[PDB]
Write a protein that binds this ligand. Structure first.
Ligand code: Y2O
Ligand code: NAG
Ligand code: NAG
Ligand code: NAG
Ligand code: NAG
Ligand code: NAG
Ligand code: NAG
Ligand code: NAG
Length: 335
């Protein structure tokens, strides 16, 4: 309804690039924030049409332009060349704050699916701290649901609409390029993956009740959406999830179909230099990988799915506003 500002813990003395950007663009966080409950009000939210998401998307585009400069950027006809130094890159949390005379309304219902009316509301001046993590298929390093796994969609009957699964317990994923230069792998505990994909099948079943629930690898598209892609320490990883989204949930029981080995699923990955950009339609070329071991240890805290008797779900992604939505869903600017 208005333009918001960001607050952060960044420090002007980190040269990590999120820190640099935030110290120029954000104000410091209030050490003790005000929050004002109101259990009577009942207030309508819509996470799928929330202008906080558009403002955040702008900010993160700006951060990546300042920070992860490509050697070449192809946008349509044009090709732009610049210095592409290797940088230190680790996302930090960002708070979005309402300016003077507006407030941010927070929905306090633990199972609120992001849509419709909400009974227990609050007024705050800033959101919680949201780490702007760019990735597909798996949402990393977010904040888990309080109670049960929530299923969010602008419209579950429209199978073109992305489904956000909000996990209530996180699942560890560890990706490494050991000391090819391009070759890397990720490891997930097959047990924890089994467990969470069962519970996700249960919630999906509540919404599609006759049908069998199948998980299957992403069909087609750019490598960025057909693998789980993400930035780790500056380098762009592309990890094959064919052994991860691979399993059936038949009779209130889940059966994993993908290959494990000693109780860990291992995704093969490549570090790539030609990137399809998430900010706009365009390509970006980066320098070859840094030296040594490149490792990220992340929490899978949500999933992005697309639905095709039987209902089949494939990993989705590609529109980073859904990443921001998965965090901003309980908030609304007012007044
Ligand atoms: C229903 N939604 C389907 C969908 C599928 C695929 C995409 C979108 C949307 N895009 C999308 O919405 O852009 C936002 C937008 C919206 C409206 C108008 C313009 C732009 C992307 C369009 N950009 C290209 N074509 N170059 C494409 N996504 C990626 O390229 C991607 O994620 N790359 C990547 C790079 C690095 C990392 Cl680390 C990473 F994790 C991922
Ligand atoms: C979310 O809840 C609303 C009612 O609050 C309901 O109308 C809508 O269908 C639900 N959507 C999903 C994806 O569960
Ligand atoms: C998370 O939610 C699921 C499904 O809604 C439920 O079965 C499970 O017990 C919950 N787990 C935890 C750790 O709260
Ligand atoms: C969402 O789903 C379908 C589109 O397939 C359509 O009936 C309408 O847009 C929506 N329906 C409901 C119940 O929201
Ligand atoms: C879940 O993973 C463990 C580890 O391999 C396995 O022993 C167990 O049988 C699996 N459960 C399934 C596939 O339902
Ligand atoms: C992932 O690996 C499988 C089997 O190794 C292969 O068939 C599939 O095409 C791969 N997908 C991508 C996007 O690399
Ligand atoms: C599941 O994994 C196996 C081996 O890891 C693979 O052969 C199979 O094609 C995968 N399922 C699908 C639907 O791709
Ligand atoms: C997730 O957070 C951990 C701890 O801050 C970090 O080491 C890891 O690299 C993060 N993952 C991504 C993809 O940013």
């Amino acid at each position: 309804k208005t333009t918001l500002f960001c607050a952060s813990d960044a420090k002007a003395y980190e040269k990590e690039v999120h820190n640099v950007w935030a110290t120029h663009a954000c104000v410091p966080t209030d050490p003790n924030p005000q929050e004002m409950v109101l259990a009577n009000v009942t207030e309508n939210f819509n996470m799928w049409k929330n202008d906080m998401v558009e403002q955040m998307h702008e900010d993160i585009i700006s951060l990546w332009d300042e920070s992860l400069k490509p050697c070449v950027k192809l946008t349509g006809g044009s090709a732009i060349t610049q210095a592409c130094p290797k940088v230190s890159f680790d996302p930090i949390p960002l708070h979005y704050c309402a300016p003077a005379g507006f407030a941010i309304l927070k929905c306090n219902n633990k199972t609120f699916n992001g849509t419709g009316p909400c009974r227990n509301v609050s007024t705050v001046q800033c959101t919680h701290g949201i780490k702007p993590v760019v990735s597909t298929q798996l949402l990393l390093n977010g904040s888990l649901a309080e109670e049960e796994i929530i299923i969010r969609s602008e419209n579950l009957t429209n199978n073109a609409k992305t489904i956000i699964v909000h996990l209530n317990e996180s699942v560890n994923i560890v990706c490494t390029r050991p000391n090819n230069i391009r070759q890397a792998h990720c490891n997930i505990n097959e047990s924890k993956w089994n467990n969470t994909l069962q519970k996700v099948g249960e919630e999906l079943a509540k919404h599609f009740p006759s049908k069998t629930i199948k998980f299957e690898p992403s069909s087609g598209g750019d490598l960025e959406i057909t693998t789980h892609s993400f930035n780790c320490r500056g380098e762009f990883f592309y990890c094959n999830t064919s052994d991860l989204f691979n399993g059936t949930y038949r009779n209130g029981t889940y059966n994993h179909t993908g290959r494990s080995s000693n109780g860990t699923i291992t995704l093969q990955c490549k570090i790539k230099q030609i990137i399809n950009m998430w900010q706009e339609v365009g390509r970006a070329i980066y320098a070859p990988p840094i030296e040594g071991e490149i490792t990220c240890n992340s929490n899978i805290t949500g999933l992005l799915l697309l639905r095709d008797d039987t209902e089949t779900f494939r990993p989705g992604g590609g529109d980073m506003r859904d990443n921001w939505r998965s965090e901003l869903y309980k908030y609304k600017v007012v007044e």
